[PDB]
Design a protein around this ligand. Structure first.
Ligand code: MNH
Ligand SMILES: CCCCCCCCCCCCCCCC(=O)N[C@@H](Cc1ccccc1)C(=O)O
Length: 454
C-alpha cells in the first residue's frame, strides 16, 4: 500500500495555482512526466487523482468498479449543455433515455445516408482551396472548423451554417469558443464570486443566449418542414426510448442540440488540424497517405465504400489521436470502496482523471519511440492491448459519434491529399490551444492544386 506523489503546493490554495495557465492539460502532462503513472491533485475542498499508465487506466475503465464522473470542467459546460448525453450522470433518467433514442442515428444505414452530406461540405472545402490565388495560405484550424461545424449542422439538423461564406467565424463558434474558454478559466479561480469576474459572468450568459437562439432557429426550421430525414434531429423529436417508451421532452432536446453541435464538430476539427500538422512535419507519411488517396478515390466524388478503403488515412487519424486526443481527459468516480492497482486505497465517490495523452505515451505499451508520428503502429489493431488507446472514452459512456467523426476525417483528408500538395511554408512551431478541447493555433500551410477535376 504506497502513497501517491503530489506536485508543488501554494499553502491554503494547495495545487490550484498549477492550473493558473491557458494550457492546463499541457501543464498536467509535464507534472505526469515528473511524478509518473499517478498523482494526487488538491484544491480547497477537493481532491482528484491523475492516471497516466495503461496498468491503472485499464482498472479505472472497469464499469463494475468506476462510473463516468463530471469534472469541474463538465460541471461548468453543463450550465449550457444541461443533461444532454455528454454532461449527464449515468443515473439521471435522461442519460439512458437519450442514449437509447439517439444511437440509431449512428447505424451503418444512417452513416451511408450522411455520406453525401459530408461530401457536400468537403467539396466546399476543396473548392475554397482550389480558388485561392498564388501564394495565399490556408488557416488550417479555422477551415477545419468551417467543415466540421457545417458537416454536423447538415448531417445532424439539415441546417446550413454556411461557414465557407464567412471570412470571420460563425457567431455560434465565437460564443461556443468563449463559453468553453470561461469553463476552463473558472477551474483555476480560488475566489469565483470576486466581483472582478462580474463581466465574465455576463459575457458567459450572452454566449449562452447566442447558442440557444441558434437552437430556436434549428427547431423552427424543422417543425416548419416536418421532414423525418432519418437524421439526429428526427430521432430527437420523434424517437421513443424502448425502455420507458417516452420521447425526449423539449428542455432535453435543446440541451442535446447544443451538445451534438459542440461535441459533433470541435474535436473532429482538432483531429484534422493535428493530422495535417503531423503529415507536413513527416513527409514519408504524407507521401504514403497521398498515394493511398490518389489510388483509392478514382471518382470525382468519394463513395462511402471508397472512404472505407483508406486504411492508411485511418491510421494517420488514429496516430494523430494517440499523440493529441482532442478531448484530452475524462473523469471517473469509485462506485464502491476498492483498491486501485493493488496499491492505492480509494473511498466510494473518489474522483479519477484519465490523462489520455500520457496514457498514449506509456512506453511499456507503445515502445520507446512514443513521440514519433508512426501510423504503422496501427497497421494491426489486435496488437494494441485492451484500454491502451482511449481517445473516445470508455464503455457505455464512450463516444457514440466515433464512426461519424472518423468517416468525416477520412473522407476530408483523403480529398485534401488527392487534390493538393501541402507546404509547411512557415516551418510552423506547434502551439496547442486549450478550450477544454485541444487544437493547434496559428497553424498555416500553402496548398498547390494538383488540378484534379471535382
Ligand atoms: C475526433 C472526434 C471526437 C473525439 C476525440 C471525441 C471524444 C469523446 C470523449 C473522450 C468522450 C467521453 C467523455 C467523458 O467525459 O467520458 C466523448 C463522448 C461523447 N461524444 Mn465524442 N463526439 C464526436 C467526436 C469525437 N468525440 C462526434 C462526431 C459526436 C457526434 C456526432 C460526438 C458526440 C459525443 C456525445 C454525445 C458523447 C456523450 C456520450 C454519452 O456519455 O452518452 N467524445
Ligand atoms: C457538449 C459539450 C462538449 C464539451 C467537451 C469538452 C470536454 C472535453 C475534455 C475536458 C477535459 C478538461 C480537463 C480539465 C483540467 C482538469 O483536469 N480539471 C479537473 C481538475 C480540477 C481540480 C480542482 C479544481 C478544478 C479542476 C476538473 O475539472 O475537475
Amino acid at each position: 500500500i504506497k502513497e501517491m506523489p503530489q506536485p508543488k503546493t501554494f499553502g491554503e490554495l494547495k495545487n490550484l495555482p498549477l492550473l493558473n495557465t491557458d494550457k492546463p492539460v499541457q501543464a498536467l502532462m509535464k507534472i505526469a512526466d515528473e511524478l509518473g503513472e499517478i498523482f494526487k491533485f488538491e484544491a480547497p475542498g477537493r481532491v482528484t487523482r491523475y492516471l497516466s499508465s495503461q496498468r491503472l487506466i485499464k482498472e479505472a475503465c472497469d464499469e463494475s468498479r468506476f462510473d463516468k464522473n463530471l469534472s469541474q470542467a463538465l460541471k461548468f459546460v453543463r450550465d449550457f449543455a444541461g443533461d444532454g448525453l455528454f454532461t449527464s450522470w449515468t443515473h439521471e433518467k435522461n442519460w439512458k433515455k437519450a442514449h437509447n433514442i439517439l444511437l440509431p442515428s449512428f447505424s451503418q444505414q444512417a452513416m451511408k445516408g450522411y455520406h453525401a452530406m459530408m461530401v457536400d461540405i468537403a467539396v466546399q472545402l476543396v473548392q475554397k482551396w482550389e480558388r485561392l490565388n498564388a501564394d495565399e495560405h490556408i488557416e488550417v484550424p479555422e477551415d477545419m472548423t468551417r467543415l466540421t461545424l457545417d458537416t454536423i449542422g447538415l448531417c445532424g439538423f439539415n441546417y446550413r451554417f454556411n461557414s465557407f461564406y464567412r471570412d470571420q467565424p460563425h457567431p455560434f463558434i465565437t460564443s461556443m469558443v468563449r463559453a468553453l474558454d470561461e469553463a476552463m478559466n473558472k477551474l483555476q479561480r480560488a475566489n469565483p464570486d470576486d466581483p472582478a469576474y462580474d463581466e465574465n459572468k455576463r459575457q458567459f450568459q450572452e454566449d449562452i443566449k447566442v447558442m440557444n437562439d441558434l437552437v430556436d432557429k434549428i427547431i423552427a426550421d424543422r417543425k416548419a418542414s416536418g421532414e423525418q430525414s432519418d437524421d439526429l434531429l428526427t430521432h430527437m423529436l420523434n424517437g421513443k426510448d424502448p425502455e420507458t417508451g417516452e420521447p425526449l421532452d423539449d428542455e432535453n432536446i435543446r440541451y442535446q442540440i447544443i451538445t451534438f453541435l459542440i461535441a459533433g464538430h470541435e474535436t473532429t476539427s482538432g483531429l484534422l488540424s493535428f493530422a495535417l500538422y503531423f503529415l507536413v512535419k513527416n513527409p514519408h507519411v504524407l507521401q504514403k497517405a497521398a498515394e493511398e488517396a490518389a489510388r483509392v478515390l478514382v471518382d470525382p466524388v468519394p463513395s462511402y465504400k471508397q472512404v472505407k478503403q483508406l486504411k492508411y488515412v485511418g491510421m494517420v487519424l488514429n496516430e494523430a489521436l494517440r499523440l493529441w486526443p482532442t478531448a484530452p481527459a475524462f473523469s471517473l468516480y469509485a462506485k464502491e470502496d476498492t483498491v486501485l492497482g493493488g496499491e492505492y486505497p480509494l473511498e466510494k465517490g473518489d474522483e479519477l482523471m484519465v490523462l489520455i495523452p500520457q496514457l498514449h505515451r506509456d512506453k511499456t505499451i507503445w515502445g520507446d519511440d512514443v513521440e514519433e508520428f508512426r501510423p504503422e503502429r496501427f497497421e494491426n489493431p489486435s496488437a494494441i492491448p485492451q484500454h491502451a488507446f482511449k481517445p473516445f472514452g470508455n464503455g457505455q459512456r464512450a463516444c457514440p459519434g466515433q464512426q461519424f467523426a472518423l468517416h468525416e476525417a477520412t473522407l476530408v483528408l483523403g480529398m485534401m491529399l488527392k487534390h493538393f500538395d501541402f507546404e509547411d511554408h512557415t516551418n510552423y512551431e506547434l502551439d496547442i490551444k486549450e478550450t477544454l478541447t485541444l487544437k493547434p493555433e496559428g497553424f498555416v500551410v500553402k496548398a498547390k492544386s494538383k488540378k484534379i477535376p471535382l
